[PDB]
């Protein structure tokens, strides 16, 4: 019924209905290949979790994903196609495979290239759609980097994981300094990408999380003292020991040169000037963003405002996970 393809240093024993498996997934949460679903005649993505269970951690990180994928559903989020196991029983049960849609590639490069507001503002619009949905599902990503935001030739955008759940330049100050983070936390990440999409290069580089915070203040602008206090004891010092960096304006930061129908480019700046706000408490919100005149264009209630998704010993997991791969 199943067949085994040896991919790299691990045998991938999937359903015969999947051919041409090719590894593209060199991620840590699992190995993901690109197969072909002969029973739909379409490109899918198969990810194998080798013995998800083996330690309280993994079994949970895995149990998380499984669950999420089953109830999370949006056109801008990596949709599930099929979870199965070759193991015949809970006994021998010890390997989980998830099939889900196959996208053409993440934003890692497309961003460099030059895209019109139409394609840009849009791709963005789509991200707020998944993110928002994700959010409306007690889920906040945190780890939003173009490295995990896949796109398709038809200009379709989707999200790969749920990242953290409860390459570093795309995280927000609340995580950098380590502090309270709200839902609008993932707005910082988007902000960067958009900029890093216009700038044509990482908005905030930095060799370390320190040199990271430094280049962000420098560039953006020193946290008005009120916020400074919200900082932990040692990190507050640091900032307070640094020169006066009133940053720059969004006009000089993102010059008109980087842009290409004439106001749109400054209309898009107004958004950045509300997405790139270090003080988390003054940073724009997904809702507000979708309403922004730069994104609103593409708005659509069916998409934007979607209906919310849904709601232990080692052995207990194996049983759980299995029970999960078995509900099909």
């Amino acid at each position: 019924n199943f067949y085994s393809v040896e991919i790299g240093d691990s045998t991938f024993t999937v359903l015969k209905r999947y051919q041409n498996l090719k590894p593209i997934g060199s991620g840590a949460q699992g190995i993901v290949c690109a197969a072909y679903d002969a029973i739909l005649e379409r490109n899918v993505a198969i990810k194998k979790l080798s013995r998800p269970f083996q330690n309280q951690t993994h079994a949970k990180r895995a149990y998380r994903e499984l669950v999420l994928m089953k109830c999370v559903n949006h056109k801008n989020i990596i949709g599930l196609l099929n979870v199965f196991t070759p193991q015949k029983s809970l006994e021998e049960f010890q390997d989980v495979y998830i099939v889900m849609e196959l996208m053409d590639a993440n934003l890692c490069q497309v961003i460099q290239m030059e895209l019109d507001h139409e394609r840009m503002s849009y791709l963005l619009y789509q991200m707020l759609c998944g993110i928002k949905h994700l959010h409306s599902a007690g889920i906040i990503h945190r780890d939003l980097k173009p490295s995990n935001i896949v796109v398709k030739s038809d200009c379709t955008l989707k999200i790969l994981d749920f990242g953290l759940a409860r390459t570093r330049y795309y995280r927000a100050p609340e995580v950098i300094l380590g502090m309270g983070y709200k839902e609008n936390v993932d707005i910082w990440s988007v902000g960067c990408i958009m900029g890093e999409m216009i700038k044509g290069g990482v908005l905030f580089p930095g060799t370390d999380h320190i040199d990271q915070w430094n280049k962000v203040i420098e560039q953006l602008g020193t946290p008005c003292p009120e916020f400074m206090k919200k900082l932990q004891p040692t990190v507050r010092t640091y900032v307070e020991n640094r020169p006066k960096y009133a940053g720059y304006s969004f006009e000089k930061l993102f010059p008109d040169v980087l842009f290409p129908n004439k106001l749109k480019a400054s209309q898009a700046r107004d958004l950045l000037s509300k997405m790139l706000v270090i003080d988390a408490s003054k940073r724009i919100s997904v809702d507000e963003a979708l309403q922004h005149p730069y994104i609103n264009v593409w708005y659509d209630p069916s998409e934007a405002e979607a209906p919310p998704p849904k709601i232990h010993t080692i052995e207990e997991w194996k049983e759980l996970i299995y029970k999960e791969v078995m509900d099909l």
Binding site: L115, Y122, V151, D154, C155, W298
Partner: peptide
């Protein structure tokens, strides 16, 4: 405003 049905990854 017809949504872009093309994206150049290459």
């Amino acid at each position: 405003p017809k949504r872009p049905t093309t994206l150049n990854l290459f």
